[PDB]
Design a binder for this molecule. Structure first.
Ligand code: NA
Ligand code: NA
Length: 327
DNA sequence: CATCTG
DNA sequence: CAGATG
């Protein structure tokens, strides 16, 4: 946790690089287990050879660990942090909508900066454009003080459209968190479920409302069950407008809300543990449901849930306020 | 995983 | 349709 920290950290730089700059998914994946294992490892790795001893730990990595232990640095790591082509990619990529693939294309065409990009807005697609248009707002955290205002609106608009809608803003927003990166809304309606064959309107009508009153400003992607947009809290009395915020809205069959809600609320740490506990208790749990575990090895059949309560109960556990869903 | 692009 | 992005 801090005993093999640099090692794990250099490994991660390396891994990351493989994958983003190079196309090195194998290699990339290689750095990864290595960091995972040394990361678990209980002692101070005093040498390459010692590391080697571990699985995932091969000769190359061992070499690397040596040089790093030997001297506060790594030449390759040094050579990579410099390199412009590499840097560009880590950069372009900050654009919402530009992944590595594209980052690479562009670089080879010479776009390496915000400016470049602006000049070449023709080469970018809708998501990418938006992404560029709000590069700034996008990287700005979201003070819960705004979150509360957002939430407030979203929920009232849903209410107006249908009394039957059930919205939830999961996220750390939900776990307590002072700020958040984006807004996640979980959505359902009674007349929508597992069997119930679709109802696209279900999600489109709401989206529509939000843009009606202008809460939603742009559309990243809009499918029948998932909507990726951009929104903004109405600028008050002109002098202080708000940054543009990323927002997501998703339709869920009523028959698997709570699992989603639970699930999406995190933290990943809480998940896992709740997850492991369920398993003991003779259960299985995932994004959409909880299933009683058979003995033949495994086994199915959706346990029926009406609140986050039903879930815990099942696994016989202490209902957790979302605040304490930390770990 | 669901959506988009081309 | 494969392949990219989130
Ligand atoms: Na990006
Ligand atoms: Na292939």
């Amino acid at each position: 946790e801090t005993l093999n920290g640099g090692i794990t950290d250099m490994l991660t730089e390396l891994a990351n690089f493989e994958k983003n700059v190079s196309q090195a998914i194998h290699k990339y994946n290689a750095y990864r287990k290595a960091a995972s294992v040394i990361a678990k490892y209980p002692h101070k790795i005093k040498s390459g050879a010692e590391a080697k001893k571990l699985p995932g730990v091969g000769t190359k990595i061992a070499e690397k660990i040596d040089e790093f232990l030997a001297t506060g640095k790594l030449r390759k790591l040094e050579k990579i942090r410099q390199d412009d082509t590499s840097s560009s990619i880590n950069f372009l990529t900050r654009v919402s909508g530009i992944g590595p693939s594209a980052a690479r294309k562009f670089v080879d065409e010479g776009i390496k900066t915000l400016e470049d990009l602006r000049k070449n807005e023709d080469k970018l697609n809708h998501h990418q454009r938006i992404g560029l248009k709000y590069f700034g707002d996008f990287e700005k955290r979201i003070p819960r003080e705004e979150m509360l205002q957002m939430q407030d609106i979203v929920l009232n608009e849903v209410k107006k459209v249908d009394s039957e809608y059930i919205a939830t803003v999961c996220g750390s927003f939900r776990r307590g968190a002072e700020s958040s990166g984006d807004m996640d809304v979980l959505l359902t309606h009674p007349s929508f479920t597992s069997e119930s064959t679709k109802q696209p309107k279900l999600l489109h009508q709401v989206v529509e409302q939000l843009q009606k009153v202008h809460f939603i400003t742009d559309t990243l992607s809009k499918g029948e069950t998932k909507f990726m947009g951009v929104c903004q809290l109405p600028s008050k009395n002109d002098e202080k407008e708000y940054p543009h915020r990323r927002i997501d809205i998703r339709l869920i069959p009523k028959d698997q809300y709570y699992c989603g809600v639970l699930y999406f609320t995190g933290s990943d740490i809480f998940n896992k543990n709740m997850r492991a506990h369920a398993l003991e208790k003779g259960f299985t749990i995932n994004e959409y449901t909880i299933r009683p575990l058979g003995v033949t090895g495994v086994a199915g059949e959706p346990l029926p849930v009406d609140s986050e309560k039903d879930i815990f109960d099942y696994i016989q556990w202490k209902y957790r306020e979302p605040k304490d869903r930390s770990e």
